[PDB]
Amino acid sequence: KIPTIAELRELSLRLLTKIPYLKMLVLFGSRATSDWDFAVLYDEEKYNLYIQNNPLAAFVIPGILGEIFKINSDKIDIVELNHCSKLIAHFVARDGKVLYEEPGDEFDKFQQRVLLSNTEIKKIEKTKLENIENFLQRWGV
Amino acid sequence: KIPTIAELRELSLRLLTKIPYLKMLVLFGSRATSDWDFAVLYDEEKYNLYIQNNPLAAFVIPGILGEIFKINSDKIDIVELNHCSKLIAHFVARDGKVLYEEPGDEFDKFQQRVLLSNTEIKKIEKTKLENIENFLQRWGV
Amino acid sequence: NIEPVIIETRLELIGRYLDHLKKFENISLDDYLSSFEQQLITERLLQLITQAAIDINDHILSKLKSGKSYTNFEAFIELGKYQILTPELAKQIAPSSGLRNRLVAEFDDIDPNQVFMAISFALQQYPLYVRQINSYLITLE
Amino acid sequence: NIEPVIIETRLELIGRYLDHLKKFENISLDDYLSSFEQQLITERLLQLITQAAIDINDHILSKLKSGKSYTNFEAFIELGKYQILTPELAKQIAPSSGLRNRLVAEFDDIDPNQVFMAISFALQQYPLYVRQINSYLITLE
Numbered sequence A, B: 001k002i003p004t005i006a007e008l009r010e011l012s013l014r015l016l017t018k019i020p021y022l023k024m025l026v027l028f029g030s031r032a033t034s035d036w037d038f039a040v041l042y043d044e045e046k047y048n049l050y051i052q053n054n055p056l057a058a059f060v061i062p063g064i065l066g067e068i069f070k071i072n073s074d075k076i077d078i079v080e081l082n083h084c085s086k087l088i089a090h091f092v093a094r095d096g097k098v099l100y101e102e103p104g105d106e107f108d109k110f111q112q113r114v115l116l117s118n119t120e121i122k123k124i125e126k127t128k129l130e131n132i133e134n135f136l137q138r139w140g141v
Numbered sequence C, D: 001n002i003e004p005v006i007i008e009t010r011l012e013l014i015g016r017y018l019d020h021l022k023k024f025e026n027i028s029l030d031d032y033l034s035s036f037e038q039q040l041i042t043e044r045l046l047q048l049i050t051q052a053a054i055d056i057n058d059h060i061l062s063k064l065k066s067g068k069s070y071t072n073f074e075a076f077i078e079l080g081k082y083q084i085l086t087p088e089l090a091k092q093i094a095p096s097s098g099l100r101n102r103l104v105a106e107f108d109d110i111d112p113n114q115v116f117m118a119i120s121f122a123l124q125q126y127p128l129y130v131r132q133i134n135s136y137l138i139t140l141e
Helices: A005-018 A044-053 A058-069 A086-095 A106-114 A118-139 B005-018 B044-053 B058-069 B086-095 B106-114 B118-139 C004-024 C029-034 C036-064 C072-081 C087-093 C096-104 C112-139 D004-024 D029-034 D036-064 D072-081 D087-093 D096-104 D112-139
Strands: A022-028 A036-042 A076-080 A097-101 B022-028 B036-042 B076-080 B097-101
Touching (some): A005 A097, A022 A086, A036 A058, A058 A076, A058 D072, A058 D112, A076 D096, A086 C004, A118 C112, B005 B022, B005 B058, B022 B086, B036 B044, B058 B076, B058 C072, B058 C096, B058 C112, B076 C096, B086 D004, B118 D004, C004 C036, C004 D036, C029 C036, C036 C096, C036 C112, C036 D004, C036 D036, C087 C112, C096 C112, D004 D036, D004 D112, D029 D112, D072 D087
Parallel strands (some): A036 A076, B036 B076
Antiparallel strands (some): A022 A036, A022 A097, B022 B097
């Protein structure tokens, strides 16, 4: 069957040795509040050394999580919190449910670092709405 | 649940009005003997006139079959028997299970028209094996 | 419950993909069939356009019909029922779900002649999709 | 029960895709990131290569383990257990399933820097995949 968030948290302790460069694993999307949406935060040092012996180490996380969580790895979407937009990091911090965390306060330090204010989101909305309106004017629709 | 081939044959009678240019519907792949693999044969006349009012009439078949068969239309792969390789038509005629057929002998006329002999398949195998071996030689592996 | 900034991000991407797809609007069928490179660009563009729309449709329906599941084809139709899209546009653009599956199907083997027709379809219908989703966001205040 | 002509067709396609992907083997990271067109070509090529291999792996496993289900990641690993692929190649090429899902993920938003690394990965590992599947077909007589 589908695993609950509780057993996902317990099974995630096996990730420290399977994914040694992993520092935080957060579940977001439909499963938290369908496909499995995970946000990962790598240790910048270990991942660089890991890529020397693994040319595509980032793309092996879904296969590793699938064998550990006993879920279909073909329905797993991974988001790199190390190199993503400020908008994606905001909603991951706002609605995400942390599954793995080292240290025990990494998710709090992540939320304090990436959470946007309502005014900052409004400014982002205004820029994208202007971009959309400009597209509509150029295309004559 | 998943519908059987029997109810697929009965529900396919509704296709004559929903897909008026359809002349034959064949189920092949895993479901016959996973995703749903259907092979369709259009009436060349009606489909051409149908495309004038429907710019993408071929891509609407999965959605139509999904609502009629009560199956996930996102897991439906369609093969046009009108414009496909001689190899695909061979295995559709060999292993396919016909679901819709007008007239009642269209699948027999299709099998007699597209079935390949063992010698013809061997000649196809030899050409592709030579192509693969040439690739391996050029790439030095 | 709908997050407009998430939808606006995807609408912005659709506009950027359409601007690149527009560069192929005047290519003849013969020149298109002779260029495997131009086929790969248009196939990838059409895949990203349809997937971004599917992402928008699921986000809207997850807040208007929480817990309800919709296929990608039925998602376009559901937006037409609620006048988020006009019923005319919803019916004409719904086959884009079949185009999406054909572009990501395991069997692959997509017909470049059908992709050629999809280029003209997307350049005409998806600008209207951007306009109507944009009006829905403005109505949401 | 395995149909070699079906597998040979897909191996032939992988070779053709690799010949086109090889044209990008000497492009610097800077020139690649500045060209959205070259990113779309390589993304589509990498998607077709991985999907063709997934199609081959499922066909082989459906005749060696009938009724058994395998994820795309575990399918590569299973071929390594039976020495159809060497265990070394199976482990190195298994993350191509994660590359496939990232290229077809609904969320899209793929990182071109990671795709750049996948170009060099595919040009080195998938030629070996073609060789080892070709040897398996020759062993099958």
